[PDB]
Amino acid sequence: GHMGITAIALYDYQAAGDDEISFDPDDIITNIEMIDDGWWRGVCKGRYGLFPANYVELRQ
Ligand SMILES: [Mg+2]
Structure with missing residues (x-):
């Protein structure tokens, strides 16, 4: 949610x-x-921080 x-x-x-x-x-x-445009911030497996945007695919 x-x-x-x-x-x-x-x-x-x-x-x-x-x-x-x-x-x-x-x-x-x-x-x-x-x-x-190149770097986003988010949460993955309880970790918070930056990651390269083109390494992920947005859901919906
Ligand atoms: Mg790995």
């Missing part, structure tokens, strides 16, 4: 810093904020 904008990971991503998150393919990213 209150998950905001959500997406599915298209690829593996390893956080390059403590301000980034990591995810595996098919993981769900929620509460997405599109703070810029």
Whole structure:
């Protein structure tokens, strides 16, 4: 419900810093904020931070 904008990971991503998150393919990213065109912010598996926008696919 209150998950905001959500997406599915298209690829593996390893956080390059403590301000980034990591995810595996098919993981769900929620509460997405599109703070810029290349990098978004959201929640994945209880972690909060930045990730590359083109590594995910928006749901609906
Ligand atoms: Mg991984």
